[PDB]
């Protein structure tokens, strides 16, 4: 869940 945000937040 919201794993797409943490993904972008971790990358960016």
Curated annotation (Swiss-Prot):
The source's domain of life comes to Eukaryota
* GO BP term, pick one: defense response to fungus
Q: Which UniProt keywords apply?
A: Antimicrobial, Fungicide
Q: Which residues form the signal peptide?
A: none
Q: What does this protein do?
A: The synthetic peptide has antifungal activity against B.cinerea (MIC=20 uM), F.oxysporum (MIC=20 uM), A.niger (MIC=41 uM), C.albicans strain 01U (MIC=13 uM), C.albicans strain 38U (MIC=7 uM), C.parapsilosis (MIC=105 uM), C.neoformans strain L26 (MIC=209 uM), C.neoformans strain L30 (MIC=209 uM) and T.rubrum (MIC=3 uM). Has no antibacterial or cytotoxic activity.
- Give the protein name, as stated in the record: Antifungal peptide
- The source organism is Cenchritis muricatus (Beaded periwinkle)
């Amino acid at each position: 869940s919201r794993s797409e945000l943490i993904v972008h937040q971790r990358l960016f």
